[PDB]
From a paper:
The reaction center (RC) and light-harvesting complex 1 (LH1) form a RC–LH1 core supercomplex that is vital for the primary reactions of photosynthesis in purple phototrophic bacteria. The RC–LH1 supercomplex comprises an RC surrounded by the LH1 ring that is made of multiple αβ-heterodimers. LH1 collects photons directly from sunlight or from the peripheral antenna, light-harvesting complex 2 (LH2), and transfers excitation energy to the RC. In contrast, some Rhodobacter species, such as Rba. sphaeroides, possess dimeric RC–LH1 core structures, representing the largest photosynthetic complex in anoxygenic phototrophs.
To verify the roles of PufX in the RC–LH1 dimer, we genetically deleted the pufX gene (RSP_0255), which resulted in the exclusive formation of RC–LH1 monomers and loss of capability to perform photoheterotrophic growth, consistent with previous results. The cryo-EM structure of the ΔpufX RC–LH1 monomer at 4.20-Å resolution shows that the central RC is surrounded by a completely closed LH1 ring of 17 subunits, adopting a slightly elliptical shape (120 Å × 115 Å). Mass spectrometry confirmed that ~27% of PufY was retained in the ΔpufX RC–LH1 monomer compared to the WT monomer. Removal of PufX resulted in an RC–LH117 complex with a completely closed LH1 ring, and thereby the loss of phototrophic viability.
Author numbering:
A (entry chain X): 7 to 49
B (entry chain M): 2 to 306
C (entry chain L): 1 to 281
D (entry chain H): 1 to 247
E (entry chain 1): 2 to 54
F (entry chain Y), I (entry chain C), K (entry chain 6), M (entry chain 4): 1 to 54
G (entry chain Z): 8 to 49
H (entry chain 2): 10 to 49
Write the structure that this text describes.
């Protein structure tokens, strides 16, 4: 467990931030794909 | 007449085991015997071989690429060694026919085994990257070992996987011959008119020459200071001795501009990567961009019109 | 001008003509007795290439061209509209490269290092001397030389190369081409280790000479050391020009055929040349 | 871009070249710059910072962290020489060589110079001297080489100067570096293997004569050669190449 | 029988890493050999059966 | 199969994870490209030809 | 052991890794099912 | 390697368990393919 | 095995096992490839010929 | 009377050889079964 | 014949065995390959003739 | 007596040679059986 | 001829033995290959025509 | 003296030569048998 020296609290906070960013980006991607599919579906 | 070629007095002994900072000694064991001829030419230590995970990874995929192409070649040879000996370097492993083109539905005879064989050499070359890379990481060296190596792979990749996909055909990759590759390189120029007016090849033409021409002098500068302590180069940046001091000014006096020990080795890899980096984008343009260099060079006044 | 430590390295002696003559330094560069001769010829040699343009009338930058005489004229009267310009511009550059090479030895002697750099260059020039007064004359006239035009960029393959077919199948050329790769593949590692030890992982120590061997030994299994490469780099690079220029000589009056057909001489071998099967037989 | 230029002739094709024109020149500026780490800023004969320095400036001085626990070197810091350059400027006028005033070989000018190194007989990364005497070389021995013991040492001027007793061998390179030639005077002189050319049966010194054998610089430690002498010996030994150009 | 004994003489780590590389390469080779043949190029027969091409 | 943690007693997790990441990514790329290669299975071609959108 | 991990550490790490593997595999199963329904390859 | 008899015993048991699992999956796969399309 | 057992004394077992494993796998692969190259013993083809798989 | 590069004992070599021979016999038995199956399916003589 | 046994007193066994193994395998391979080329002795072709498999 | 270079004894060499000859005879016997089988199946004379 | 035993006093037996073995084998292969190449004494070839195995 | 570079004795050389000659005679006898067999089967004169 000595590869970076981060704490459980530090890793918790960092992971929460990263997941928030991931969810934001994924939401934008979902909106984009929905818009394209409505405009022109690829199935 | 002693132009610094041969050791005159031969002294030999127990090889150094090796020095470890962060090296996984589990993968490193054993030492090797001593080479005869090079003891005149120079050093003789042949080993030790780091049976690394990537090295093992490269060990098989290279070997399967090494061996498997042999067997399909025998299918050409008719199982006759004297036939195989005679038309050695005449056997040539073809890619799929252009009807298949990009499509990976090739039969084994008609280039299916190329994609089979080529996938394994595809594994080995990339896996050797880290074997260089990781070992520097254990000893804390620069990663230039990696970045000069990727220079070749970027152009090595475009020959097979990058340039052919942009058109959408596997014929436009290189057949695996000892002579079919060489006929292919001439064939490439003929396909796109002449390869003459292809710029990034013509740029690459300069820099392969820059490799050996410059380094003949670079070594000679070191060869000049084997009397002046050239083989202790590592601290000759740190402790600038007469090795660094004298010859460099000769490069001031001949060329006007001179250099030092530390920056002289920048030119080595940095010029060398121009050998491979330039061609990778350069070979692209013939297929997906400029189908005939003979007319494209006419645009910018380097062709006769 | 002078570096922070240069001054003491300039001593007015050893010069090839006479020890103490014409050995002043013009700022960073040195101009001397042999210092004139290359400056003498190169200064005009460029400018008559400019006069090559006017004979055509073209001034488009690359479209300027210098035209050698064909086989016919040789050592005779030749219109400068065709020749006696490429023939004279031969005089300038040919003297220059000899002038510059033999210039170098004086400052080599002054700083007391080997003649290898003049030796290396003088041998590098020997590839050029192969191209004019050697390959043309060995048949008999300079017609068999490529034009000294910039826009040609050595595009004489039209009649030059394919008279021999696939020309990378000159045996020496097959050897010659491979050499620059052998240099360029090895070149990285010396450009690596001394530079990769000079630059370690940002945050790691500079390396020691004991570190130097271990990296290369565990990788491929053999270390000759630093000097082995510099010698090989000189063994390689001069061999590459040696095995290239030599085969240039044996294109003339030695090989008048197609270079592929020579490899059939192995396929000609009476013992197993004619066993049916495979690709030949 | 299927044969489709943006307009006329300018497309992605020329884009690569136009990229390559700018891309190359930036590196060449960087390549010129990173070679500028010894002897800058430029000086003149007098010692003033020269009028011309050039468009390419000094790159940032990065002090290297050093191994062995010896200390640190800051390169490029202020460049120092700290060595005998007692000389005579032939001309106050700009652009003249510098005549040797007294005995140059003590001072070391032209081919005779010798640089101020570290004063440490260099140990290896394992903590032992890189150059080890044969007698003090534990384990290694003369294996298959022409043991110079038995070869009369000959100078350029064709006088027998001495005879070899031991070889101070390079342990890392496992190739010989220095040759013990103790002279008839009494001092034990080392000559680098690289400098002189031995055939099958003799030891010939083609750079300097047997009179300069008498002044070959002495070593303070009969067990370890110091760095400063290394050049100072060779600077003494290799300098006479031109002073003894006659004879 | 009893083949425990190999481990105490012959290294584990190398065994597992080499075996992993071996198995992946082997599986890829066999799959590609299948895919190259017209029969057992299951994509093509899938197309032909559902006659979509 | 609970006993499988001994391999983690054997293997440093970081390198296994990075090898796995490269492995998975390259494999997904290869499968996707083999798919898109086939005229039969090519969702872009299928959509283009079905919806008459050539 | 190359690595010095404990039984508890390896237990936790393996549990986490298996959870991730099961999640990824579940997504893969859903994807394959969707494709097969859309267009079977058998 | 310095492993004990007990250590080698445990490691071999684990490895054999893994081998049997993998082989079982392979057997199932081959059976499925052969039923779907035999190659004999 | 009366006297054969001393062979392991003169040959280091680790290396002989490595070499044997490499040799065995190479041999099996080579023989299988040779077998396939023969049209009579292309076990893919026999399946194709029997069941009339085009 | 060991006489090896290797320092193994007579007992160690005995055990190792027994293990190796057991493995060889197992592998050979599988090979025999395979060859018999192929020959029955399609003899090559 | 009786006293040959000093050859091991002359030669190191292990190198003799390495050479013998390489020699024997390479020899067997080349003999087999020549037989296999030999139309009279290609058992794989001979298997075809007697059974009318083409 | 011996020359003295590998350092094996007369007894050691005796045992090693006996083992090697046993192996040679076994291998040769198998070869003889194989050649006989082939010759019966298809003679090459 | 009687004091040929001094030959081994002049030369090391091991090197001579290596040379003899290598030379003998290279030689024997040479002659066999030449006979096999010559059509009269390719002993394989005759066996076909005598037995009419084609 | 015994002019020994290899340092073998007269007795050692005697024994070694006897062994080598025995081997040579054995090999030559086999060769003679082989040549006789071939010549009977198909003479080359
Ligand atoms: C004897 C040496 C060869 C030759 C070999 C090459 C090769 C090969 C190449 C050049 C390229 C170039 N050539 Mg040249 N070139 C020759 C004759 C000439 C002449 C002339 C009118 O005679 C001129 C002005 C030039 C000028 C130029 C340079 C601008 C350029 C860079 C050289 C380098 O870095 O290496 N060459 C002769 C025939 N030169 C290089 C370049 O940058 O191409 C884009 C290149 O690839
Ligand atoms: C045979 C027809 C073409 C030709 C066809 C090719 C092909 C095809 C390839 C090369 C390639 C290479 N060729 Mg070219 N090559 C020609 C003439 C030359 C000449 C010359 C001035 O005589 C030289 C020095 C070279 C040298 C070289 C290198 C610059 C380059 C390999 C760099 C790398 O990493 O890959 N060729 C002729 C005119 N060459 C590579 C390259 O850069 O291609 C664009 C490559 O793949
Ligand atoms: C089919 C046409 C041939 C070709 C035709 C020629 C001709 C013609 C000549 C050379 C010359 C040279 N070419 Mg070539 N050359 C080709 C491709 C290459 C390739 C490659 C494939 O990578 C390389 C590295 C080279 C390298 C070189 C050198 C061997 C040689 C110059 C001498 C020297 O000192 O260097 N050529 C193609 C394949 N090459 C040229 C040169 O500059 O000679 C001085 C020259 O005149
Ligand atoms: C027509 C659709 C293709 C298909 C399209 C894809 C694509 C595309 C991918 C996978 C991926 C996977 N496929 Mg699928 N795959 C097909 C047929 C199969 C069959 C089968 C015998 O039917 C199997 C067992 C698999 C197995 C798998 C896994 C290797 C992998 C899912 C993650 C994992 O490793 O667990 N594929 C069919 C023929 N499959 C995914 C993957 O690579 O995960 C890592 C992936 O990207
Ligand atoms: C018509 C059939 C579908 C197809 C069917 C599948 C199947 C089957 C699988 C994926 C899988 C995935 N596909 Mg999808 N996929 C296709 C084309 C796409 C494209 C694209 C534009 O090329 C993208 C970006 C993706 C994206 C993705 C990833 C989310 C995922 C692979 C990542 C991984 O680690 O594995 N697919 C077409 C459109 N996709 C794999 C997955 O789910 O990984 C978890 C998987 O098993
Ligand atoms: C038509 C089928 C082929 C055949 C197909 C295979 C294949 C395929 C393989 C073997 C393998 C083996 N074959 Mg079989 N083999 C054939 C003919 C023979 C004959 C014979 C004279 O009839 C013999 C003695 C052998 C001998 C052997 C062994 C070398 C080996 C089994 C393990 C071992 O070494 O013990 N093969 C016929 C002609 N055999 C296997 C092997 O390589 O084991 C290592 C293997 O993979
Ligand atoms: C028609 C010619 C005969 C023939 C004529 C001879 C003769 C003559 C002699 C040998 C002898 C030898 N032959 Mg025969 N030999 C034939 C066929 C073979 C074949 C084969 C695959 O067909 C092989 C590999 C051998 C191999 C050999 C060795 C057994 C032996 C030499 C070994 C050595 O150290 O030297 N023969 C054919 C059938 N062979 C030599 C011998 O007896 O060595 C002891 C020898 O003098
Ligand atoms: C600078 C451009 C040249 C280049 C680059 C290059 N290749 C490299 C490297 C570098 C910098 C290595 O150090 C790396 C290596 O480990 O070499 C031993 C490698 C390597 N280049 C290889 C191949 C190779 N590269 C070649 C060419 C070139 N490689 C270019 C000319 C050639 C030919 C045809 O001349 C070959 C055969 C291997 C020797 C090696 C990677 C190991 C392997 O898998 O094989
Ligand atoms: C194989 C021998 C090659 C060679 C080497 C060479 N010439 C060189 C250099 C080198 C390494 C220099 O450093 C030197 C120089 O001043 O460069 C700025 C020079 C130089 N090469 C020049 C040109 C030149 N040399 C030529 C010849 C050759 N020089 C070959 C390329 C050519 C060609 C390509 O044929 C040209 C165009 C000069 C401008 C210059 C020598 C000094 C001068 O002013 O004249
Ligand atoms: C003793 O007997 C044996 C058999 C062991 C031998 O010794 C035989 C040994 C041999 C070496 C056999 C002879 C075969 C060699 C000589 C091969 C020579 C190969 C070349 C000359 C060509 C090398 C490379 C050429 C190029 C340009 C390759 C393209 C670069 C890569 C990017 C190719 C990658 C291609 C693809 C398709 C990757 C993707 C994989 C798909 C399946 C997705
Ligand atoms: Fe340097």
């Amino acid at each position: 467990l000595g590869y970076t020296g981060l704490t459980d609290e530090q890793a918790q906070e960092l992971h929460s931030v990263y997941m928030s960013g991931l969810w934001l980006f994924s939401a934008v991607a979902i909106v984009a794909h929905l818009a394209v599919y409505i405009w022109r579906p690829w199935f | 007449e002693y132009q610094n070629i041969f050791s005159q007095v031969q002294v030999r002994g127990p090889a150094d085991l090796g020095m470890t900072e962060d090296v996984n000694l589990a993968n490193r064991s054993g030492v090797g015997p001593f080479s005869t001829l090079l003891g005149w030419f120079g050093n003789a230590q042949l080993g030790p071989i780091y049976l690394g995970s990537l090295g093992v990874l490269s060990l098989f995929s290279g070997l399967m690429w090494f061996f498997t192409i042999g067997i399909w070649f025998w299918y050409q040879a008719g199982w006759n060694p004297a036939v195989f000996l005679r038309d050695l370097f005449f056997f040539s492993l073809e890619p799929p026919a252009p009807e298949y083109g990009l499509s990976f539905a090739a039969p084994l005879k008609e280039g299916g085994l190329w994609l089979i064989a080529s996938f394994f050499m595809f594994v080995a070359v990339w896996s050797w990257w880290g074997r260089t890379y990781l070992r520097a990481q254990a000893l804390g060296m620069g990663k230039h070992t990696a970045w000069a190596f990727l220079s070749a792979i970027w152009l090595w990749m475009v020959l097979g996987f990058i340039r052919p996909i942009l058109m959408g055909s596997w014929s436009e990759a290189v057949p695996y011959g000892i002579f079919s590759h060489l006929d292919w390189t001439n064939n490439f120029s003929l396909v796109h008119g002449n390869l003459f007016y292809n710029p990034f090849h013509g740029l690459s033409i300069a820099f392969l020459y820059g490799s050996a021409l410059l380094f003949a002098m670079h070594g000679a500068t070191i060869l000049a200071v084997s009397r002046f302590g050239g083989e202790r180069e590592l601290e000759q940046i740190a402790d600038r001795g007469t090795a660094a001091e004298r010859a460099a000014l000769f490069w001031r006096w001949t060329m006007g501009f001179n250099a030092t020990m530390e920056g002289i080795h920048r030119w080595a890899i940095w010029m060398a990567v121009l050998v491979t980096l330039t061609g990778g984008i350069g070979i692209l343009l013939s297929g997906t961009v400029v189908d005939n260099w003979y007319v494209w060079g006419q645009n910018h006044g380097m062709a006769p019109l | 001008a002078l570096l922070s430590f240069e001054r003491k390295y300039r001593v007015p002696g050893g010069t090839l003509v006479g020890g103490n003559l014409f050995d002043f330094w013009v700022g960073p560069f040195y101009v001397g007795f042999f210092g004139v001769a290359t400056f003498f010829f190169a200064a005009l040699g460029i400018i008559l290439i400019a006069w090559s343009a006017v004979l055509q009338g073209t001034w488009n930058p690359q479209l300027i061209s210098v035209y050698p005489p064909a086989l016919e004229y040789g050592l005779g009267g030749a219109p400068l509209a065709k020749g006696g310009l490429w023939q004279i511009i031969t005089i300038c550059a040919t003297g220059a490269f000899v002038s510059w090479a033999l210039r170098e030895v004086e400052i080599c002697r002054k700083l007391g290092i080997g003649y290898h750099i003049p030796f290396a260059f003088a041998f590098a020039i020997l590839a050029y001397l192969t191209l004019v007064l050697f390959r043309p004359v060995m048949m008999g006239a300079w017609g068999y030389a490529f034009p000294y035009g910039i826009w040609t960029h050595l595009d004489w393959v039209s009649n030059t190369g394919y008279t021999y077919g696939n020309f990378h199948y000159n045996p020496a050329h097959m050897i010659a081409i491979s050499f620059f790769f052998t240099n360029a593949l090895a070149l990285a590692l010396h450009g690596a280790l001394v530079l990769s030890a000079a630059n370690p992982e940002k945050g790691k120590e500079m390396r020691t000479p004991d570190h130097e061997d271990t990296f290369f030994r565990d990788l491929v299994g053999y270390s000759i050391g630093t000097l082995g490469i510099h010698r090989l780099g000189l063994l390689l690079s001069l061999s590459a020009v040696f095995f290239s220029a030599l085969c240039m000589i044996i294109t003339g009056t030695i090989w008048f055929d197609q270079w592929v057909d020579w490899w059939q001489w192995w396929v000609k071998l009476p013992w197993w040349a004619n066993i049916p099967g495979g690709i030949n037989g | 871009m299927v044969g489709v230029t943006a307009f006329g002739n300018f497309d992605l094709a020329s884009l690569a070249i136009y990229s390559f024109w700018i891309f190359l020149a930036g590196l060449i500026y960087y390549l010129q710059t990173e070679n500028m780490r010894e002897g800058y800023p430029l000086e003149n004969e007098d010692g003033t910072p020269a009028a011309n320095q050039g468009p390419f400036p000094l790159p940032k001085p990065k002090t290297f962290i050093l191994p062995h626990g010896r200390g640190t070197l800051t390169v490029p810091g202020p460049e120092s020489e700290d060595r005998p350059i007692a000389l005579a400027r032939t001309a106050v006028s700009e652009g003249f060589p510098h005549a040797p005033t007294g005995d140059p070989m003590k001072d070391g000018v032209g081919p005779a110079s010798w640089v101020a190194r570290r004063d440490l007989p260099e140990l290896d990364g394992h903590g032992h001297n890189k150059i080890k005497p044969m007698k003090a070389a534990a384990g290694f021995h003369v294996s298959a080489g022409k043991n110079p013991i038995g070869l009369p040492v000959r100078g350029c001027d064709l006088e027998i100067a001495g005879k070899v007793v031991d070889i101070w061998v390079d342990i890392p390179e496992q190739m010989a570096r220095f040759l013990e030639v103790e002279l008839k005077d009494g001092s034990t002189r080392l000559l680098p293997m690289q400098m002189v050319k031995v055939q099958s049966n003799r030891v010939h010194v083609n750079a300097l004569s047997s009179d300069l054998f008498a002044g070959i610089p002495t070593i303070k430690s009969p067990t370890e050669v110091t760095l400063l002498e290394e050049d100072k010996i060779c600077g003494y030994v290799a300098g006479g190449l031109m002073y003894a150009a006659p004879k | 029988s009893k083949f425990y004994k190999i481990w105490m003489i012959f290294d584990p780590r190398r065994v597992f890493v080499a075996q992993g590389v071996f198995l992946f390469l082997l599986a890829v080779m066999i799959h590609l050999i299948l895919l190259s043949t017209p029969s057992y190029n299951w994509l093509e027969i899938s197309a032909a059966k559902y006659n979509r091409v």
